[PDB]
Amino acid sequence: GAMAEEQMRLPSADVYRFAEPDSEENIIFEEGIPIIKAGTVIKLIERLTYHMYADPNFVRTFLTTYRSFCKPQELLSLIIERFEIPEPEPTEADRIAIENGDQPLSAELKRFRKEYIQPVQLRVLNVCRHWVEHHFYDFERDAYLLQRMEEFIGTVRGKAMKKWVESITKIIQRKKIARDTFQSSPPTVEWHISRPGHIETFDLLTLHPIEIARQLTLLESDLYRAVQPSELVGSVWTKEDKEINSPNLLKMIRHTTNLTLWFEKCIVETENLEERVAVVSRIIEILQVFQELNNFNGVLEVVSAMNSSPVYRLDHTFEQIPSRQKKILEEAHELSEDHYKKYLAKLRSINPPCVPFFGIYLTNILKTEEGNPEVLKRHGKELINFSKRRKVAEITGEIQQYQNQPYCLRVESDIKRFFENLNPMGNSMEKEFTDYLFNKSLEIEPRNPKPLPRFPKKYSYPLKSPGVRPSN
Ligand SMILES: COc1cc2ncnc(N[C@H](C)c3cccc4ccccc34)c2cc1OC
């Protein structure tokens, strides 16, 4: 019948793997264009380059997430095999015309070429164009992958495929060369005790708190904007090959660790109580400027530092902090309460520019990865859970909508370098250092009923803050 006629027009399974009938044993949809819930790698590839209709949403999500279930080298091989479609044999009337010496009719072959081979091959090139344009990192990481792609794209003889090879060749040309401006007047760079150039005197209390907040916001904005979606998929930042797969993500996390621990270090290594109060007060001022700038990443780094085991227990220090600053810390902490309800409402209400709290995306992605299975079972056969990947991809999409928000703030190279080079842990491991920090906390403020000892001053310069109002 017509169902068999439609199927038998496609190539046979002994010579082509991407043309078997769809069943519950190899592909399932959710509930227009149907959304793919799960399937085999073969069926995913077929639907990635489906002949009847274009599916740009599935292409975007596939190329973002595929590394969680398929290697880059394996993906190339599959789209090559998908491209290399075998043509059906001519009919008996047509076949005899060849050995006689005459041109056949070839109506079934022309229709197959028109409505299958050409459409499928068109979609494969669209995937290649999307791959090189939006995920070039794969090709620069694995040089052999690029040679194969260039070799494949080089050997595509076609009239209708001429524009696609030209466009794909244009992008690799740009990406090869890509290896090697304010709208308003930025405010004047602020200084306090440390002079411009005197980099050896740079410190928490010697730099201006306004400028610490500005330079950290510029730094963190750049780090936030550098993170690519694929770095977050499949928990690849916690796997063995984390440094190659998730370098921008790891830079973000390590900065957060180093800044947070540096705040804690600054506090507990200031053993004199009155000096430690000035240190804590200055960090709260830094948070106030983070809040002015809508650098929520920054705000919650300060909250983390203040809520840490060595700092949160310093009752004698926080007694001397003015109620106004206590309230600022309370309201900052309140952002995180009830699954970040207040934070999320604040982030949606504001206009650009901002730096979103990065930690929440990592938390939610880790929950999705751990909470959903890697594969679904149907009739004994395991199928790749694509909905799991799409949910992770949807979270990385939220990250991307805040990645084009540059600040109207001038960089200070020396202050930038200071914060880029922070190494509060030194040559200690993290657990060792955080044990040291808590042991330091116990020394400076012993647990009751032990007495509170006095300690000498370490700072020879004035501790009064210049405040957080900028000059004008
Ligand atoms: C559920 O337990 C908590 C409730 C909190 N409620 C409000 N704020 C917190 N943290 C802020 C950042 C903060 C830190 C340290 C000293 C502060 C002193 C006065 C005002 C705020 C302080 C909280 C922290 C908690 O555990 C860590």
**Which one of 264, 315, 320, 329 would you pick to mutate in the ligand 1 pocket, going by the greatest count of ligand atoms within 8 A of its CB?**
329
Measured in Å, residue 150 CA sits from the centre of ligand 1 at 57
Please answer whether residues 133 and 67 qualify as being in contact, where contact means their C-beta atoms are separated by less than 8 angstroms: no
Strands of 381-385's sheet in order across = 27-29, 36-39, 381-385, 375-378
Q: How far apart, in whole angstroms, are the C-alpha atoms of residue 213 and residue 324?
A: 19
DSSP state of 355: B
Q: What resolution in angstroms, rounded to 1 decimal?
A: 1.9
Look up residue 200 and give its two tokens: 């050896």
For the chain, residues classed under CATH 1.20.870.10 are 9-176+359-401
> Where does 187-358+402-471 sit in CATH, by number?
1.10.840.10
Q: In this structure, are residues 287 and 328 in contact, taking their beta carbons and an 8 Å threshold?
A: yes
Protein residue whose Cα sits closest to atom 2 of ligand 1: 307
The residue type at 468: V
Spatial distance between the Cα atoms of 154 and 160, rounded to a whole number of angstroms: 15
Say if ligand 1 is within 6 A of residue 169 CB. no
> What atom of ligand 1 comes closest to residue 303's alpha carbon?
12
Beta bridge partners of 377: 382
| Sign of torsion over alpha carbons 383, 384, 386, 392 | positive
Mutate to test the pocket of ligand 1, among 314, 320, 330, 335 (most ligand atoms within 8 A of CB): 330
Whose alpha carbon is nearest atom 25 of ligand 1?
307
Centre of ligand 1 from the C-alpha of residue 307, in Å: 6
Q: Which fold has domain 9-176+359-401?
A: Son of sevenless (SoS) protein; Chain S, domain 1 (1.20.870)
Structure tokens at 143: 């040089």
Helix, strand, coil percent content, the chain, rounded in steps of 5: 60, 5, 35
What is the C-alpha to C-alpha distance for residues 189 and 110, in angstroms, rounded to an integer?
70
> Residues 281-286: contacts with CB within 8 Å, 24+ apart?
281/321, 281/322, 281/325, 281/465, 282/204, 282/205, 282/209, 282/465, 283/204, 284/321, 284/325, 284/328, 284/329, 285/209, 285/465, 285/467, 285/468, 286/209, 286/212, 286/213, 286/216
Ligand 1 touching residue 306 (CB < 6 A) = yes
DSSP state of 295: B
DSSP three-state, residue 75: helix
| Residue to substitute in 312, 319, 337 for testing ligand 1 pocket (most ligand atoms within 8 angstroms of CB) | 312
Distance from the first to the final alpha carbon of the chain: 84
Q: Which residue has the tokens 């109506």?
A: 107
Residues near 393 by beta carbon (within 8 Å), at least 6 away in sequence: 60, 61, 64, 65, 229, 233
C-alpha 172 – ligand 1 centre gap (Å): 52
Of all protein residues, the one whose alpha carbon is nearest to atom 26 of ligand 1 is: 307
3-state secondary structure 213-234: HHHHHHHHHHHHHHCCHHHCHH
318 lines ligand 1 (CB under 6 A): yes
Calculate how far, in angstroms, residue 302's C-alpha sits from the geometric centre of ligand 1.
11
Domain with CATH 1.10.840.10 in the chain: 187-358+402-471
For tokens 């299975």, name the residue.
373
Residues with Cβ within 8 Å of 85's Cβ and at least 6 positions away in sequence, in order, are 11, 16, 116, 117, 120, 121
Q: Which amino acid is at 335?
A: L
What spacing in Å lies between the alpha carbon of 332 and ligand 1's midpoint?
A: 9
Q: Which atom of ligand 1 is nearest to the CA of 332?
A: 12
Query: How close is the Cα of 322 to the center of ligand 1, in Å?
Result: 14
Q: Which two tokens stand for residue 103?
A: 């041109």
- Residue found under tokens 């500005």: 214
Rg over CA atoms, the chain: 30
Q: Which residues contact 34 (CB under 8 A, 6 or more apart)?
A: none
Note the helical H segments in 143-272.
143-154, 162-177, 209-226, 242-245, 247-268
Collapsed DSSP state (helix, strand, coil) of residue 67? helix
Elucidation method? X-ray
Pairing of strands 27-29, 36-39: antiparallel
Residue with tokens 């009938």: 21
277 lines ligand 1 (CB under 6 A): no
Enumerate residues 6+ apart whose C-beta is below 8 A from 281. Answer: 321, 322, 325, 465
- Strand, coil or helix: what is 424? coil
